[PDB]
């Protein structure tokens, strides 16, 4: 993995997603060199950069032009990005312009989760995987329900991570806010 | 329990200890109206205030004179403090001046945990309880090994707490750093 | 707090609720000697026993006759139960037969959470507290929306508890399933 | 990742290590096709199988003849194993017979952690990575002190994982015991 500290960040754009979470997203996604992936709400680019180096084509979407700008910087810096199509704009409309996908990671929904998912279902190639990253309690509930209603077998794993911070004398355990991963299939 | 946001802070002083943790500290301590308690490293006063309203006499110790002033402000602010003896100074010398104790909560050791624990065993009335609050990995190990070496039946419980926060479009789970409670048999 | 291992379990009855959770429930409930409390879904009696020794009258409700029997057994074993009115039956019908309450703990809803909460609100005395114990993701969401819709100031805390256990001459950390407490402003 | 439920368990051999933990071990290990790895205490084979399909040669060690049998069995069922050298015996003895390593995962130490680590240092190729999986509190402390003492830049990450399970028409969260990963520098 590309460590979190190698991500240039713009304080107005969240991310990158916790390395341990991005690691699990990749395990769940099972990126293949012939896969076409979409990262809805690319933010700082934490998920996009990892997908960039493992799949054929990645479509990174974001409402915020700054997120688009920051994701491109991190890509440029890590020598990735020539197989990444950046798309500024609201997800539903952006999603309609791309081809079918093998992998769909929803890093942000902005109130349009349900709409985003329905669309993703219609574009998901057979054997495709959907992974929704949820920090809001509502999102965890809505992602679960949405995917079930669309006919998927849904699973949810919540991660509570703590890392050692050498805080002058000992190692203090500093926790990261919990993040849940709602993912489809069996 | 006095909510955490009703504690007057001071930048140099850590605390108050997470309400959920203070709650468990009290459950493990089993405060009695005829108990004499000592709060080693009172900090902001989170543990001292709770003990104040439940036991006969509380001895609150701290190296930081600002921890002493902040604990006083909080004691006065909540109408408590007439059964609290504040003691500024390093714990080992401060501990030697107090009578025997029924309850001992170690909220901070500053490198002298082992010494602090030994003195505490010497002043512990029968049936007394010792509870060490540990945020450093090293402290969790030492508190366990030390209390066992002093002949106590030891236990440890770690709490990972997450609370909700109305975040910009919903409810975000904001985790608190993990805190372990190393305690001796009652 | 009455230790978890001092509770007799029945195969068809869940519980007792984790001591650390019961501890927090009590901190949030702030039991007073003149309080009238209701424990919806008493199960094994974990919450009922604690309330029994702190309030004036407790109304313990449960669908399962085996739960009513176990809660009754555990009270007797602990010399409690004279201020406890056991009520077998579905929560809504039973809730309508009791007087107004100062404290309401919902330990189980069985699909009728919303109904149970509406009824509790209609019977809550001024300054009363409601605490819902949620292990199901749906319940955490449902309790939050419902309490707000009923005009309450809602809060949620999710505890992840780990307890040390002897293993290989060392100490292994054993986790308990996470439990969330959804409670209203006091 | 090879799903957890796709490993055959022997009742006397622990494992496989939680998929989410094995996922992170791989992220931290950064397996390369020309890497030589050693899995100290292979148990059920959770770490060995993952390394098998990513590196050049893997040396899987275990005291338990049954652990060696379970690992070979799981290797065979997944069509792996031709690049895995199984070694029954105590780790230090076994570690001395293998060539230098790029990756070292310590899945079990059995009281000889310090010795095992000192030896791993003596055979670690430049740019090599060491990752110790710790479930015992003592091991977390020990791994840190030892690795610091051997001159490494040490880090610790503690994972608390919860997975949803269908219960009473809802989804309850089921936690796994916490596991810490103590790993070395660049
Ligand atoms: N409906 C929508 N359409 C497009 N982008 C959206 C959106 N709702 C939210 N977003 C974007 O969702 C992103 C979530 S932050 C994502 C961080 C990223 N996973 C990382 O690892 O760096 C934000 O940049 C936000 O603007
Ligand atoms: N050896 C020692 N003697 C006295 N005070 C000490 C000490 N080691 C640490 N401390 C004190 O330990 C405290 C830890 S912060 C404690 C916060 C408190 N439990 C609350 O709930 O508000 C600090 O104020 C620090 O100065
Ligand atoms: N609508 C309802 N009416 C009555 N009891 C209900 C109910 N829905 C669920 N329950 C009961 O809710 C209980 C939840 S288990 C509660 C365990 C208890 N808190 C303890 O500490 O021991 C079960 O015994 C179940 O039958
Ligand atoms: N000194 C030692 N030498 C060799 N094996 C050892 C050892 N100390 C402990 N072990 C082994 O350590 C293993 C730990 S269990 C490992 C499970 C494995 N990580 C999985 O994912 O399946 C056991 O099989 C045990 O016998």
Q: Where are the beta strands (DSSP E) in C91-147?
A: 101-106, 124-134
Report the alpha-carbon distance of residue B117 to residue B124 in Å, rounded: 10
Biggest CA–CA distance in chain C, Å, is 55
The Cα–Cα gap between A62 and B31 comes to 55
Q: Rounded to the nearest 10 degrees, how much is the dihedral formed by the CA atoms of C112, C115, C118, C124?
A: -60
Under DSSP, the state recorded for D10 is P
Contact partners, residue D179, CB within 8 Å, separation at least 6: D17, D18, D21, D133, D134, D135, D158, D159
Return the C-alpha torsion angle D23, D24, D27, D32, nearest 10.
-60
Find the helix or strand (DSSP H, E) in which A137 lies. helix A137-149
Strands C170-175 and C154-167: antiparallel
Q: Closest Cα partner for C162 from B142, D146, B157, D18?
A: B157
Q: Hey, whose CA ends up nearest to atom 23 of ligand 4?
A: D43
For C49, the 3-state DSSP assignment is helix
**Which two three-digit tokens encode residue C69?**
């029997």
d(C-alpha C47, C-alpha C22), whole Å: 6
CA distances for D117 relative to A184, D45, D88, D128, D155, angstroms? 40, 20, 18, 13, 15
Separation between Cα atoms, residue C175 and residue B140, nearest integer Å: 17
CA-based nearest residue to C106, from C85, C78, C126, C135: C135
- The C-alpha R_g of chain C, in whole angstroms, comes to 16
B144 inside 8 A of chain D by CB: yes
CB crowding A54-85: b at 16 or more within 10 Å, else e: bbebbbbbbbbeebbebbbbbbeeeebbeebe
**Token output for A184:** 């489809």
* CB A29, CB A55: distance < 8 Å: no
Task: Give the whole-angstrom CA distance, residue C23 versus residue C8.
Answer: 19
In the structure encoding, which two tokens stand for residue C157, read together?
Answer: 């805390």
CA of B91 to the centre of ligand 2 (A): 9
D22's tokens: 């094995």
**Ligand 1 close to Cβ of residue A14 (< 6 A):** yes
- Asked whether the bond before C177 is cis by omega within 30 degrees of 0, the reply is no
Buried/exposed code over D130-166 (b: 16+ C-beta within 10 A; e: otherwise): bbbbbbbbbbbbbbbebbeebebebbbbbbbbbbbee
Q: CA B51, CA B78: separation in Å to the nearest integer?
A: 13
- C177–chain A Cβ distance below 8 A for any pair: no
What pairs with residue C164 in β-bridges? Answer: C173
The DSSP H or E segment spanning D164 is strand D155-167
Query: Cα dist. D18→A144, D5, D21, D24, D125 in Å?
Result: 23, 10, 5, 10, 28
Structure tokens, C142: 């449902």
CA C126-C130-C134 angle, to 5 degrees, is 170
- A62 CA distance to ligand 1 centroid (A)? 5
C37 token code pair: 């409390």
Of the candidates B104, D135, B42, the residue with the CA atom closest to the CA atom of residue C171: D135
Taking every pair of C-alpha atoms in chain B, what is the biggest distance, in angstroms? 55
Three-state secondary-structure class, residue A60: strand
Q: If DSSP codes are grouped into helix, strand and coil, which group holds residue B151? A: coil
A93 touches chain D (CB under 8 A): no
For chain A, report the end-to-end CA distance as a whole number of angstroms.
Answer: 26
Choose the closest CB to A173 out of B111, B137, B173: B137
Q: What residues are in contact with ligand 2 under a 6 Å CB criterion?
A: B 13-17, 41-47, 61-64, 67, 90-91, 107-110, 112
Which whole-number Å values give the CA distances from A52 to A31, A83, A89, B81, D52, in the listed order?
10, 7, 20, 62, 25
Burial of residue B166 (number of CB atoms within 10 Å: 0-12, 13-18, 19+): exposed
Alpha-carbon distance values, C86 to B58, C32, C59, C78, D19 (Å): 40, 20, 6, 16, 45
Give the Cα separation of A116 and A131 in Å (integer): 12
Distance D41 CA to ligand 4 centre (A): 3
B169's CB contacts (< 8 A; 6+ apart) are A110, A111, A136
Which bin fits C97, alpha (ψ -120 to 50), beta or left (φ > 0)?
alpha
* β-bridge pairing D155-167 and D170-175: antiparallel
Phi, psi values for residue A45, rounded to 5°:
105, 5
The span from the first CA to the last CA of chain D, in angstroms, equals 25
Integer Cα distance of A32 and D152 in angstroms: 35
The length of chain A is: 186
Which H helix or E strand runs over A109?
A: none
Of the candidates C23, C158, C171, the beta carbon closest to that of B27 is on C23
Cα–Cα distance measured from residue A117 to residue C68, given in angstroms and rounded to the nearest whole number = 45
Closest approach of B164 to chain A, Cα-based (Å) = 8
CB of B75 closer than 8 Å to CB of B84: yes
Residue matched to tokens 């714990």:
B91
Q: Which of A1, A30, A156 sits opposite D164 (nearest CB)?
A: A156
C74 lines ligand 3 (CB under 6 A): no
Q: Do B178 and D158 touch (CB under 8 A)?
A: yes
D16 lines ligand 4 (CB under 6 A): yes
Taking contacts as CB-CB distances below 8 angstroms, the residues of chain D near C174 are 177
Q: Which residues contact A133 (CB under 8 A, 6 or more apart)?
A: A17, A21, A25, A47, A105, A106, A107, A179, A180, A181
Which of D170, D177, D178 should we substitute to test contact with C (largest number of C Cβ atoms within 10 Å)? D170
Quote the CA–CA distance of C90 and C61 in Å, as a whole number. 8
CA-based nearest residue to B77, from B127, B3, B149, B138: B3
C159 touching A (Cβ < 8 Å): no
CA–CA separation, A60 vs A87, rounded Å? 6
D140–chain B Cβ distance below 8 A for any pair:
yes
Tokens, residue D172:
């309850």
Phi then psi dihedrals of residue A159, to 5 deg: -115, 130
Residue A42 assigned ligand-binding role: yes
CA distance D115 to A7: 38
Rounded to 5°, the CA angle B1-D178-D29 comes to 140
Residues 6 or more apart from A173 whose CB is under 8 A from it? A162, A163, A164, A165, B135, B136, B137, B177, B178, D156, D158
Give how far Cα C27 sits from Cα of B27, B147, C24, C145, Å. 10, 28, 5, 23
Q: Are residues A157 and D20, on separate chains, in Cβ contact within 8 Å?
A: yes
Task: Return d(Cα D155, Cα A25) in angstroms, integer.
Answer: 22
Total length of chain C:
186
| Phi-psi domain of C23 (left: phi exceeds 0; alpha: psi -120 through 50; beta: other) | alpha
Chain B closest CA to C45's CA: distance in Å?
18
Query: Is there a contact between C168 and D137 if contact means CB atoms under 8 Å apart?
Result: no
Three-state secondary-structure class, residue D96: coil
Ligand 3 midpoint to CA D18 (Å) = 32
Cβ within 8 Å of residue B55, ≥6 positions away = B31, B32, B33, B34, B35, B36, B37, B83, B102, B103
Cα separation, A68 vs A86, in Å, equals 7
Q: Nearest-CA neighbor of D143 among D176, D118, D178, D124?
A: D118
Residue nearest to atom 14 of ligand 3 (CA): C108
Q: How far is CA D59 from CA C93, D51, D52, D89, D147, in A?
A: 66, 10, 9, 12, 21
Closest among A98, A100, A103 to A85, alpha carbons compared: A98
What is d(CA A137, CA A140) in angstroms, rounded to the nearest whole number? 5
**How far is the first Cα of chain B from the last one, in angstroms, to the nearest whole number?**
22
Q: Are C130 and C37 in contact (CB under 8 A)?
A: no
Distance A112 CA to ligand 1 centre (A): 11
CA D181 to chain centroid, in Å, comes to: 10
Residue with tokens 């019977």: C123
Please state, in angstroms and as integers, the Cα–Cα distance from residue C12 to each residue in B185, C65, C66, C67, following that order: 32, 10, 7, 8
Query: Contact, B46 vs B8, CB < 8 A?
Result: no
Q: Helices A137-149 and A113-123, interaxial angle, to 10°?
A: 40
Please check whether residue C91 is in contact with residue C116, taking contact to mean a CB–CB distance below 8 angstroms.
Answer: yes
CB contacts of C138 in chain A (<8 Å) are 141
SS3 assignment, position C25: helix
Q: Are A37 and A130 in contact (CB under 8 A)?
A: no
Domain spans, chain D:
2-186
Enumerate residues preceding breaks in chain D (C to N > 2.5 Å): none
Distance linking the first and last C-alpha atoms of chain C: 22
Cα gap C25→D18, rounded to integer Å: 32
Please, what is the angle between helix D137-149 and helix D113-123, to 10°?
40
At D74, which helix (H) or strand (E)?
A: helix D65-77
A94: three-class secondary structure by DSSP: helix
Quote the CA–CA distance of B36 and B51 in Å, as a whole number: 9
Q: Provide the shortest C-alpha distance from residue D167 to chain C (in Å).
A: 8
DSSP C84-98: EEEEES-HHHHHTTS
Task: Estimate the crossing angle of helix B19-29 against helix C19-29, to 10 degrees.
Answer: 110
Q: What is the 3-state secondary structure (H, E, C) of B3-37?
A: CHHHCCCCCCCCCCCCHHHHHHHHHHHCCCCCCEE
* Residues D84 and D60: beta-carbon distance below 8 Å: yes
Contact B178 D156 (CB under 8 A): no
Pairing of strands C179-184, C124-134: antiparallel
CB C38 within 8 A of CB C51: no
CATH topology for A2-186 is Rossmann fold (3.40.50)
Q: Where are the alpha helices (DSSP H) in B63-136?
A: 65-77, 91-96, 113-123
Q: Do A163 and D155 touch (CB under 8 A)?
A: yes
d(CA D43, CA A45): 37
The Cα C33–Cα C58 span in angstroms is 11
Whether D32 and D26 have beta carbons less than 8 Å apart is answered as no
State which H helix or E strand residue C27 sits in. Answer: helix C19-29
Q: Are the C-beta atoms of residues B52 and B80 closer than 8 Å to each other?
A: yes
Which of D159, B106, D138, B135 has the alpha carbon at shortest distance from A167?
A: B135
Tokens of D156: 């610790």
User: What are the angstrom distances between the C-alpha of D92 and each of D64, D105, D110, D184?
Assistant: 14, 14, 11, 20
D160 shares contact with chain B (CB less than 8 Å): yes
Residue A49, burial from CB neighbour count under 10 angstroms (0-12, 13-18, 19+)? buried
CA separation for the pair B138, B109 (Å, rounded): 12
Q: Which structure tokens are listed for D18?
A: 């939680």
């Amino acid at each position: 993995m590309i460590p979190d500290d190698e991500f240039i960040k713009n304080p107005s754009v969240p991310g990158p997603t916790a390395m341990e979470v991005r690691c699990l997203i990749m395990c769940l996604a099972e990126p293949g060199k012939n896969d076409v992936a979409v990262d809805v709400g690319c933010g700082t680019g934490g998920v996009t950069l990892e997908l960039a180096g493992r799949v054929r084509r990645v479509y990174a979407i974001d409402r915020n032009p700054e997120a688009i700008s920051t994701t491109e910087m991190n890509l440029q810096r890590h020598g990735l990005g020539d197989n990444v199509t950046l798309m500024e704009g609201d997800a539903p409309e952006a999603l309609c312009k791309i081809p079918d996908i093998d992998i769909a990671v929803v890093g942000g929904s902005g109130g349009e989760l349900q709409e985003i998912l329905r669309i993703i279902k219609d574009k998901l190639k057979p054997g495709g995987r959907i992974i929704v990253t949820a920090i809001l309690l509502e999102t965890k509930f809505e992602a679960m329900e949405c995917l079930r209603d669309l006919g998927f077998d849904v699973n949810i794993t919540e991660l509570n991570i703590a890392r050692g911070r050498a805080l002058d004398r000992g190692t203090m355990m500093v926790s990261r806010n919990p993040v849940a991963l709602i993912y489809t299939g069996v």
